[PDB]
Amino acid sequence: SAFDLGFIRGMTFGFVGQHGTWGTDEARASMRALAEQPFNWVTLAFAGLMEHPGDPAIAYGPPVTVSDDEIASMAELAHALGLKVCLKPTVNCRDGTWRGEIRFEKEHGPDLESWEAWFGSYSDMMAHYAHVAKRTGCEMFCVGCEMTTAEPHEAMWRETIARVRTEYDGLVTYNCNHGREEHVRFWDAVDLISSSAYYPIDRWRDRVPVLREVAEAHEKPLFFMEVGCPSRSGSGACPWDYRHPGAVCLDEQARFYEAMFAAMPDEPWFKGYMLWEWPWKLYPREAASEDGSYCIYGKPAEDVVARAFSAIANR
Numbered sequence: 524s525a526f527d528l529g530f531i532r533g534m535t536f537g538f539v540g541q542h543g544t545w546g547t548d549e550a551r552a553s554m555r556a557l558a559e560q561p562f563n564w565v566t567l568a569f570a571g572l573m574e575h576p577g578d579p580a581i582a583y584g585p586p587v588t589v590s591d592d593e594i595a596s597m598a599e600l601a602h603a604l605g606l607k608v609c610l611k612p613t614v615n616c617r618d619g620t621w622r623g624e625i626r627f628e629k630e631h632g633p634d635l636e637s638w639e640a641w642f643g644s645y646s647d648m649m650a651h652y653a654h655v656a657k658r659t660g661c662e663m664f665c666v667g668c669e670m671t672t673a674e675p676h677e678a679m680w681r682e683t684i685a686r687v688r689t690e691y692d693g694l695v696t697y698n699c700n701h702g703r704e705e706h707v708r709f710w711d712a713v714d715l716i717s718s719s720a721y722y723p724i725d726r727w728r729d730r731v732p733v734l735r736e737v738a739e740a741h742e743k744p745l746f747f748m749e750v751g752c753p754s755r756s757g758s759g760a761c762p763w764d765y766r767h768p769g770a771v772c773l774d775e776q777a778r779f780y781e782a783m784f785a786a787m788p789d790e791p792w793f794k795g796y797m798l799w800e801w802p803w804k805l806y807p808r809e810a811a812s813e814d815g816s817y818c819i820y821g822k823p824a825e826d827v828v829a830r831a832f833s834a835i836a837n838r
């Protein structure tokens with residue numbers, strides 16, 4: 524039962540998972556550092572590529588992504604360090620279009636620029652990596668991330684998930700974007716509801732009640748498969764924006780984490796936090812004060828999180 528899952532104190536690693544990058548000594552060192560934090564989970568996240576948001580072809584595997592061996596190598600390392608592992612393949616667009624906005628002028632037809640064709644490629648990709656997750660003992664598999672335009676294609680999502688279930692016996696989640704939790708119609712097909720909970724600092728309190736209602740309505744636990752904030756000025760107001768025009772501001776990131784932890788209640792429907800994110804090439808701690816990324820390492824947010832996560836664990 525998903526209801527039995529230990530509360531998640533997690534971190535996403537390695538995105539976007541470019542070929543060869545996880546096979547490095549730098550990546551192994553970065554994973555060792557991640558496991559020294561009070562985390563019980565890591566998510567191995569990487570992205571295949573679509574040429575454009577209206578092209579149904581998806582390039583995955585070498586030379587674009589980390590190899591299956593690289594995946595296995597990082598999973599084995601994480602497991603040897605006592606972490607549970609979620610595998611999260613997703614898709615990006617080479618022109619930089621958000622995957623939540625992919626669009627096809629046609630619905631059906633495998634050889635056409637259609638949703639049917641796109642789901643064919645996507646499902647091939649997910650089926651392959653579900654098998655990898657099974658062969659490498661990954662405790663969770665994430666079947667999608669922020670696919671807002673794809674979500675209404677419910678029958679096709681259910682087809683995708685059914686195929687994943689034949690290839691993989693562990694926990695399955697789908698990760699919707701913030702504000703989509705109540706709109707997704709196939710939560711029954713997965714084990715855990717999850718979201719990219721990039722809520723601005725001032726929105727947390729008002730949003731919790733809907734999160735509770737979604738979990739209770741669907742009789743499923745809910746967690747955050749992504750949550751985080753860049754350490755840049757003003758970023759707390761738009762935590763999802765990774766190219767925010769502002770100077771480094773460590774305290775802003777720490778303010779995001781305080782607001783989130785202050786808002787979330789200690790209730791059974793809520794299963795925790797998969798933080799965004801940790802790089803395969805980790806900067807020295809000294810260099811932290813100069814870093815504007817989502818990474819919390821070496822920053823005041825590291826302590827806010829440690830304090831919060833250590834309190835949870837040692838309870």
Ligand SMILES: OC[C@H]1CNC[C@@H](O)[C@@H]1O[C@@H]1O[C@H](CO)[C@@H](O)[C@H](O)[C@@H]1O
Nearest residue numbers: 538539615669719749762763764765800
């Ligand atoms: O802005 C933070 C997240 C929100 N959810 C999806 C994810 O893609 C996004 O991360 C950025 O991802 C891009 C690549 O798609 C990467 O260039 C950035 O450095 C962030 O990791």
